[PDB]
Every structure is written in C-alpha cells, then in structure tokens.
Amino acid sequence: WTATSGSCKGRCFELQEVGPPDCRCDNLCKSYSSCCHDFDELCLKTARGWECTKDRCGEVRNEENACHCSEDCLSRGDCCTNYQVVCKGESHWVDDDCEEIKVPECPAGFVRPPLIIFSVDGFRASYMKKGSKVMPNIEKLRSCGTHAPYMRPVYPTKTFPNLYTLATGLYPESHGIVGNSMYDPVFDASFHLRGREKFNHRWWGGQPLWITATKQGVRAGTFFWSVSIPHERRILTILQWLSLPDNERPSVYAFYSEQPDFSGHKYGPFGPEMTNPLREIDKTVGQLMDGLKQLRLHRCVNVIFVGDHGMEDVTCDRTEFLSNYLTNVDDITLVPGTLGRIRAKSINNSKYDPKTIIAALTCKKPDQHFKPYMKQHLPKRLHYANNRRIEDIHLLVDRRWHVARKPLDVYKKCFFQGDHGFDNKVNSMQTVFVGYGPTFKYRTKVPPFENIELYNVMCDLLGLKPAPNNGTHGSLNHLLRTNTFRPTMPDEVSRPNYPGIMYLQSEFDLGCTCDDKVENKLEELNKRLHTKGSTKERHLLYGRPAVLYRTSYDILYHTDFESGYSEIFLMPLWTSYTISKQAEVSSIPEHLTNCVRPDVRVSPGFSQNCLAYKNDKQMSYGFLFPPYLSSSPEAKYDAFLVTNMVPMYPAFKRVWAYFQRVLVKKYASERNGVNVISGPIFDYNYDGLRDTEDEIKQYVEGSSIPVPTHYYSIITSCLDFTQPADKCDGPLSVSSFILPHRPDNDESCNSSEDESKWVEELMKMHTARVRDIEHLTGLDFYRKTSRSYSEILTLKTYLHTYESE
Ligand SMILES: *[C@@H]1O[C@H](CO)[C@@H](O[C@@H]2O[C@H](CO)[C@@H](O[C@@H]3O[C@H](CO[C@H]4O[C@H](CO)[C@@H](O)[C@H](O[C@H]5O[C@H](CO)[C@@H](O)[C@H](O)[C@@H]5O[C@H]5O[C@H](CO)[C@@H](O)[C@H](O)[C@@H]5O)[C@@H]4O)[C@@H](O)[C@H](O[C@H]4O[C@H](CO)[C@@H](O)[C@H](O)[C@@H]4O[C@H]4O[C@H](CO)[C@@H](O)[C@H](O)[C@@H]4O)[C@@H]3O)[C@H](O)[C@H]2NC(C)=O)[C@H](O)[C@H]1NC(C)=O
Numbered sequence: 001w002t003a004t005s006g007s008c009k010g011r012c013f014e015l016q017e018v019g020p021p022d023c024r025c026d027n028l029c030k031s032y033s034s035c036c037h038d039f040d041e042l043c044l045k046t047a048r049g050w051e052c053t054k055d056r057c058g059e060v061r062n063e064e065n066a067c068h069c070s071e072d073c074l075s076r077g078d079c080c081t082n083y084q085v086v087c088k089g090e091s092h093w094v095d096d097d098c099e100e101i102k103v104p105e106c107p108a109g110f111v112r113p114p115l116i117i118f119s120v121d122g123f124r125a126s127y128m129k130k131g132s133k134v135m136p137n138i139e140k141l142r143s144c145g146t147h148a149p150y151m152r153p154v155y156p157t158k159t160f161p162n163l164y165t166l167a168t169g170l171y172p173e174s175h176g177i178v179g180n181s182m183y184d185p186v187f188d189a190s191f192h193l194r195g196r197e198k199f200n201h202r203w204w205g206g207q208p209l210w211i212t213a214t215k216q217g218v219r220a221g222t223f224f225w226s227v228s229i230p231h232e233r234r235i236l237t238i239l240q241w242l243s244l245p246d247n248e249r250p251s252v253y254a255f256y257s258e259q260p261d262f263s264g265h266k267y268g269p270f271g272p273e274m275t276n277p278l279r280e281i282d283k284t285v286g287q288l289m290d291g292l293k294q295l296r297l298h299r300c301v302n303v304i305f306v307g308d309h310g311m312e313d314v315t316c317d318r319t320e321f322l323s324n325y326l327t328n329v330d331d332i333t334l335v336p337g338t339l340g341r342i343r344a345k346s347i348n349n350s351k352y353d354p355k356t357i358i359a360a361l362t363c364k365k366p367d368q369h370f371k372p373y374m375k376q377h378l379p380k381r382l383h384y385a386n387n388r389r390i391e392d393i394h395l396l397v398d399r400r401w402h403v404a405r406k407p408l409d410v411y412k413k414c415f416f417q418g419d420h421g422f423d424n425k426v427n428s429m430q431t432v433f434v435g436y437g438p439t440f441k442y443r444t445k446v447p448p449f450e451n452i453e454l455y456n457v458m459c460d461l462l463g464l465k466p467a468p469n470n471g472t473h474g475s476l477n478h479l480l481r482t483n484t485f486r487p488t489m490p491d492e493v494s495r496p497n498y499p500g501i502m503y504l505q506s507e508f509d510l511g512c513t514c515d516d517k518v519e520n521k522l523e524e525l526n527k528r529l530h531t532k533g534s535t536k537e538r539h540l541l542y543g544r545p546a547v548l549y550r551t552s553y554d555i556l557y558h559t560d561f562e563s564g565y566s567e568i569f570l571m572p573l574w575t576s577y578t579i580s581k582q583a584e585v586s587s588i589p590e591h592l593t594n595c596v597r598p599d600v601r602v603s604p605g606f607s608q609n610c611l612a613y614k615n616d617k618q619m620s621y622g623f624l625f626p627p628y629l630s631s632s633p634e635a636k637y638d639a640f641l642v643t644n645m646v647p648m649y650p651a652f653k654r655v656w657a658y659f660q661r662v663l664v665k666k667y668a669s670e671r672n673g674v675n676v677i678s679g680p681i682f683d684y685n686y687d688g689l690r691d692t693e694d695e696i697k698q699y700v701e702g703s704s705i706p707v708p709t710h711y712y713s714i715i716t717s718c719l720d721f722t723q724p725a726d727k728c729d730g731p732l733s734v735s736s737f738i739l740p741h742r743p744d745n746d747e748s749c750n751s752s753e754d755e756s757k758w759v760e761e762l763m764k765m766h767t768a769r770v771r772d773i774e775h776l777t778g779l780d781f782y783r784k785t786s787r788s789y790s791e792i793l794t795l796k797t798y799l800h801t802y803e804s805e
Pocket residue numbers: 170171173174175176202203204205206383386387388468469470687688689775
C-alpha cells in the first residue's frame with residue numbers, strides 16, 4: 001500500500017529513497033508502482049524536447065520545459081546539453097581535438113574526480129570496429145582514452161549476473177545472482193526479471209560499489225533506472241546531481257541503456273535494424289559529454305563505457321528438445337534457453353535419478369548441440385557450482401542454439417533472432433571496455449581482461465578500499481595514469497624441508513618392483529650434484545612456488561625436474577621442468593614398464609605403495625614428470641620414483657599420456673622451449689578453493705592416498721619466441737589447464753577415436769588462468785622474476801581462450 005497523495009515537489013530523483021506508505025520520487029519508484037501522483041508532471045517533464053534552438057536562447061525560465069536555454073540554467077545545472085553550442089557558439093565535445101588530460105581539471109570544491117559508469121546492455125565487442133562510422137562520440141572516447149579490444153563477461157553471459165559482477169567484483173556463484181531466473185530452495189522462493197521478489201535484499205550478496213562508497217563516506221548516485229524513464233532524462237538527472245553543493249553531490253554515478261540488447265534480440269547482433277540503436281547510444285554519449293563540457297567537468301570526470309555481454313545469432317529452428325532424449329520429461333523442471341539447469345519437478349519423487357538423466361542426455365545424437373554436466377564437472381574457469389541456487393544438472397549449450405523441454409514451449413510463448421547466455425569464452429559474448437579521464441591513460445590499448453577485475457579499479461578511481469572479491473587487485477594497474485594499487489606478494493606460510501638420503505631400499509615394503517640393478521666417480525659426483533639441486537635454475541625458472549597454508553612438505557631435486565612433495569597428501573603439490581626446443585621424446589624401455597622405485601629421501605610412511613593400486617580395480621597411476629622427456633637413459637630412472645607417482649583412472653591416463661608424450665614436445669617446438677609446472681588439485685566441495693585433508697571423499701582402495709579431482713599444468717615461455725624459454729629477457733607467455741580427473745571420457749563424444757582427434761580439444765575446453773590454479777592449490781607462482789609484480793598479476797589472470805581472432 002502506498003499513500004500516493006504525498007508530493008514529489010522538490011524531491012525528483014531523490015537519492016535517499018523513503019519508506020512506505022510515504023510515496024516515492026526515486027529512480028525506481030515506477031518499478032515498484034510507488035511514485036507520488038505528481039511524479040510524471042514534476043519529474044518527467046518533456047515540454048519542448050531535449051535541445052535548445054536559436055529562438056530559445058536567453059529565454060525566460062519556464063519550469064514546464066524538459067531542459068532550459070535561459071541564462072541562469074548553468075548555475076542551476078539544467079540547461080539542455082546543447083545550450084552552449086546553440087546559444088554561445090561553443091563546439092560539441094566530439095568536434096574538439098583530444099588533448100591529454102594529465103591532471104583532474106575540476107571546479108573548486110571537488111574532493112576527487114567523479115566516476116560515471118555508462119553501461120550498455122548487449123553491446124558486443126565487435127560493434128566498436130563494425131559500427132565505428134555511426135558512433136563518433138564513442139570512437140573519440142575509445143581512441144583518446146584507454147580501451148581493451150574486448151572485455152570477458154562472466155558465465156552465464158546474462159544481464160543480471162553480469163551487471164552485479166561489475167558492481168561487486170564477484171563471480172555469480174558468490175554474489176548469488178546466478179541467473180536472470182532462480183529458485184532458492186532454502187528460501188523456497190523464485191527470482192524473476194518481472195515481478196517483486198527480485199526487490200528482496202536476501203537475493204543480492206557481496207557488497208556492490210554504491211554500498212562500498214557509502215560505507216566509506218563517498219556519496220553515490222542511484223545506479224538502477226526504471227525502464228520508462230527516457231535516456232535524455234537519466235543524463236540530465238546525472239548532470240543536475242553533479243551541480244549539487246559539495247556536501248550533497250555524489251562522487252559516483254551509473255547510466256544504464258537497455259540498448260542495443262533490446263533490438264539485438266529482435267534482429268540479431270548485425271541485423272540492418274541495429275544501426276539506429278547504435279546511433280542513438282552514441283548521441284546519448286554525446287549529450288553526456290556536451291553536458292559535462294558546459295559544466296567544465298569534461299576534463300575532471302572519469303568515464304567508463306562498459307558492456308555486460310555481447311549477442312549471438314539464435315533462432316527458433318535451432319532448438320534441441322529434451323523430449324527427444326527423455327521419456328520422463330514431465331518429472332523435470334528445466335531453466336531453458338542458452339543454458340540449461342535441470343532439477344526434479346517434485347522433491348517427493350523418490351525415483352528421480354540425476355545419473356540416469358545425464359546418461360540419457362550424453363552423446364545421443366551425432367551433432368548434439370548441448371552437453372550435460374554435473375555442475376562440479378563444468379570447466380573450472382566458469383566458477384559456476386558453489387551456490388544452492390545452481391541446479392546439480394547443467395547443460396552447456398552450443399553457441400547459436402537453445403535448449404527447451406518440449407516443442408510446445410517454443411511455439412506457445414518466429415520471435416527472436418539474437419540471444420546470449422553461452423560460455424563466456426565465446427567470441428560473440430565478448431563485450432566492451434573504454435576508460436576516459438584524468439585517472440586513465442591517454443591513447444592506450446590494453447590487453448583483454450575479465451569484468452570481475454573492474455570493481456577493484458572503480459574502487460581505486462574513487463580512493464575506496466574494495467570489499468573482498470574475485471578480482472586480482474593490481475592486475476589492471478596498466479590501465480591507470482595514477483591511483484595504482486601496489487600490492488606485496490603474499491608471505492610464504494610453510495617452508496620446505498630438503499631431505500637427503502636417509503632410508504635403505506629394504507625399509508620399503510610397498511609391493512613395488514623395478515628392474516634397476518645396473519652398475520664410476522666421474523658420473524657419481526655428477527648424480528649427487530643433481531640431487532643437491534645443480535640443475536634447479538634450468539627447471540625452476542621463476543623460483544619455487546610459495547606454499548600459502550600450513551603443511552609439511554619436501555623439495556626434491558633431480559636432473560630433469562624439481563618437485564615440492566607433500567607428506568600429508570603423499571604426492572607432489574607441484575612438479576617443475578623445462579623442455580627446450582631441441583629436446584627429444586623417448587619411449588619407456590620394456591624393462592621399466594611397471595617400474596616404481598622407492599625414494600630413499602622419503603620415509604616408507606610418507607610414500608605411496610604399489611599394492612594399493614594393484615588392489616584398486618578402478619584406479620591406476622601416472623607420473624607428474626613424464627618419463628618420455630628424460631634427458632638420458634640414466635636420468636630416466638628418476639621419473640619412476642614413487643614420489644613422482646599420482647593416482648589416475650585408466651580413462652584419464654589416455655588424456656595425460658597424450659599430453660605428456662605428444663603435446664609438451666609440440667609446445668616446446670612452437671614456443672621455443674617451455675617451462676611446465678604440473679600437479680594435483682583436490683576440490684571435492686567444488687568451491688574453487690584448495691581442500692583441507694578432511695574434505696577428501698575418495699582414496700586409493702585400502703590406503704591413505706587421496707584421489708585428485710583435477711590435474712593442472714602451467715606452461716610458460718618467452719613472449720618474444722625468438723628467445724628460448726630459459727633465456728628470456730622480457731615479458732612471459734602462459735597457457736594453463738585444469739583437467740577433470742574423471743573415470744570415463746563421456747565428456748568427449750569422439751573419445752573412442754585416436755587421442756589426436758579429441759584430447760587437445762578437451763584441454764582447450766578446460767583452459768585456466770594461473771590465478772584459478774592458485775586458488776585451487778594455495779600456491780603462489782612466479783615468485784622470482786625480474787618483471788614488475790603488477791605485470792606478473794596480469795600474466796596470472798591471463799586466459800588463453802582458443803577462439804579465432
Ligand atoms: C571469490 O571472492 C569471495 C569474497 O572473498 C570468496 O567468498 C568468500 O569465501 C570464504 C571462504 O569460503 C567465505 O568465508 C566464510 O564466511 C562465513 C561468514 O559468511 C557470511 O559473512 C560474509 C561477510 O559479510 C558474507 O559475505 C557471506 O555472504 C555469503 O552468504 C550469503 C548467504 O547468507 C549470501 O547472500 C552471499 O551471496 C554469500 O554467499 C556465498 O558464500 C557462501 C560461503 O560463505 C556460500 O555458501 C554461498 O553458496 C555463496 O557462494 C556470509 O553471509 C563463515 O561462517 C565461514 O566460516 C566457516 O568456515 C571456516 C573455514 O575457515 C571455519 O574455520 C569456520 O569455523 C566456519 O566453519 C563453521 O561453519 C561451517 C559451515 O556452516 C560448519 O560446517 C563448521 O562445522 C563450522 O562451525 C567462512 O569463513 C566468505 O563468506 C565468502 N564471501 C562471499 C562474499 O562469498 C570466494 O571464495 C572467491 N572465490 C574464488 C574461486 O576465489
């Protein structure tokens with residue numbers, strides 16, 4: 001209930017929104033159906049349009065008018081944005097040459113440069129080049145400011161998850177807005193774009209930028225706009241707020257455009273009808289910049305032009321129907337479209353089995369355009385599992401496609417030609433970033449980066465301390481002229497032991513065997529030196545990783561590789577080795593096929609054993625340092641040490657062996673040497689963080705050997721590939737993966753074929769940032785380089801996406 005017969009006089013777009021049944025005059029009153037009776041008359045004036053004309057110059061102020069052309073308007077802050085151009089012979093901002101903004105040039109009384117976030121829904125990254133002729137204002141922001149070729153959205157590439165990630169720096173699984181539509185089973189309530197439940201604050205986790213600002217004494221304009229408030233009115237409202245007295249004036253604002261998304265759905269990302277919405281957005285940016293220029297704020301404000309996601313071609317005919325795969329289709333609820341989320345229609349259904357639903361949806365049609373997953377098996381780079389609002393069963397849908405439950409759903413609701421929501425690596429889902437102003441760099445292009453990083457930078461721009469978030473603070477320092485954040489490397493928590501030879505062969509009763517009783521002082525001092533770490537600078541090129549949690553571990557040196565061996569998990573946390581361009585792949589000799597050798601530096605009690613693997617009919621083993629890449633027949637023996645062994649399903653060993661035998665050498669050949677660090681990951685609770693030992697749900701039968709959920713590798717070389725990996729003078733290049741350690745290859749529909757036809761594609765699907773591996777292991781990599789730490793943080797957030805240009 002609203003007493004809508006209070007008034008909006010003097011209250012239009014009030015920043016402190018008032019409590020029911022007192023009526024409202026804020027940005028969102030329309031959305032709540034709670035505006036005072038006179039809101040439209042007083043706050044949504046339209047009389048005479050949005051532009052000054054020659055006859056209106058120096059007019060008498062008429063309060064009915066949408067904006068003003070009178071002499072007093074500038075003091076008041078409510079001139080039409082083109083007032084100085086029409087009435088004072090000024091030029092439009094877009095027609096002025098750009099000039100470096102070295103320092104904020106702000107009116108007296110401004111304590112910090114304001115920040116204006118200009119957010120555009122569905123603005124696909126390629127619009128910057130493809131629409132450049134019709135977007136002169138945006139092109140000036142882009143060419144004169146700092147820009148990335150594209151910005152990576154989060155998954156799912158929907159509006160609400162992405163705007164709220166922008167606001168918070170958090171993955172959807174952490175902020176809780178995991179879709180445009182959601183069921184929370186704790187609340188037993190549903191969240192939808194249309195309706196009232198989305199207004200409840202219990203949906204919205206983390207701490208968005210406007211709250212961060214308020215908590216720290218920085219006033220914020222309201223970020224949200226009701227759809228019926230015209231764009232010119234949103235711009236004029238921001239320009240009036242900027243004219244408030246110092247004590248009332250916000251320092252941070254957002255504008256939101258529903259375009260070009262709205263038209264993109266109807267006409268496709270590049271429909272001829274798309275030109276007009278792009279023109280209209282540009283004119284809005286123009287009105288803002290002209291308006292700032294009139295207020296002498298155009299070299300004072302930092303402006304961010306940013307999108308939430310792109311737009312792909314998707315039509316009705318490109319729909320897969322679950323009714324074509326499932327006989328029980330009415331016993332499930334599907335969240336449909338450009339992703340699928342499945343749960344049971346009724347929690348009282350005891351015969352609902354997710355395992356049989358997944359099997360019925362797996363590799364059933366030759367060109368099947370979606371892939372089912374238990375959410376914990378989704379690529380770790382999506383960070384899309386650790387929320388009760390995300391259903392256990394997920395469908396990753398191919399770009400250009402929809403999934404629906406039954407044909408009736410699609411023709412009882414062709415309407416649309418564009419949609420979005422797909423995997424956030426997909427080129428069509430990429431969006432835009434431009435920063436322009438005194439705090440951003442001048443005429444600078446930066447590499448693509450993820451939208452989770454922006455909250456930290458917006459905090460830097462405003463002098464705020466960010467709430468804990470998923471950005472890596474410092475990794476975007478290269479966007480900024482000043483206000484950079486200078487972090488220190490985290491402190492190592494556990495120091496390693498460096499064990500020497502302390503055990504006799506016969507102390508080990510591991511059920512292991514090796515044919516190694518082979519027979520010199522020239523070569524014996526040599527092997528001892530290698531065991532003392534003489535080759536370690538070749539194989540540990542960027543220093544040893546730091547262990548950031550409490551544990552007991554040993555550094556083990558060898559001719560070809562160095563490892564940090566966990567006495568708790570009975571295997572390496574990490575294994576590091578360098579493979580030059582010239583290196584040769586050899587085979588495992590016949591005599592060594594089932595060889596596993598005791599490591600006389602490590603107690604039998606801290607070792608794996610072969611009997612456990614023999615007993616465990618499901619589990620086999622592999623090696624972290626590949627025997628195939630040994631430098632010599634003699635060095636090869638080190639690769640068979642029980643301390644280089646890890647538990648591996650036979651199905652996974654196909655993957656691992658092809659990676660180690662074929663791909664490592666291929667990358668060394670393509671990149672001029674590679675350094676590789678590989679290791680296990682344990683993430684049984686799918687939270688993206690390193691498990692403690694008491695979280696482990698599976699061990700090798702009858703043993704204390706924990707089974708990894710994933711295996712990682714980080715493959716580093718010189719960015720200038722004319723220099724070998726081990727003699728690199730400048731910036732580095734990295735690609736990494738987090739491969740799921742699965743007992744079958746059901747994920748890969750073509751896995752009955754030769755590994756050359758499917759393994760590399762699997763690895764590409766599971767591409768990862770070094771930072772993702774750090775969260776999952778509690779390690780910190782690249783500790784000893786000569787590069788600036790900010791540059792290393794950028795390297796650690798890099799994701800190799802394997803999309804064309
Ligand atoms: C991305 O960045 C974010 C931000 O840094 C990282 O998320 C953090 O991860 C931390 C580790 O998991 C986590 O710390 C926990 O906090 C608990 C207190 O939580 C409340 O307070 C904070 C601060 O105000 C608040 O932000 C939280 O908000 C969450 O929960 C509400 C629901 O009420 C949501 O609205 C909101 O969206 C958000 O949800 C997300 O986080 C939770 C986990 O907290 C998930 O379950 C959700 O799915 C969703 O992802 C909270 O309101 C605190 O109680 C925890 O302490 C327990 O665990 C520690 C381990 O050290 C143990 O020592 C303690 O004793 C304690 O254990 C006891 O409780 C157990 C569970 O009930 C029980 O089993 C035991 O027996 C014990 O009695 C813990 O410290 C932090 O909250 C979140 N923050 C956010 C914002 O999500 C994230 O990890 C990063 N991601 C990656 C990949 O790096």
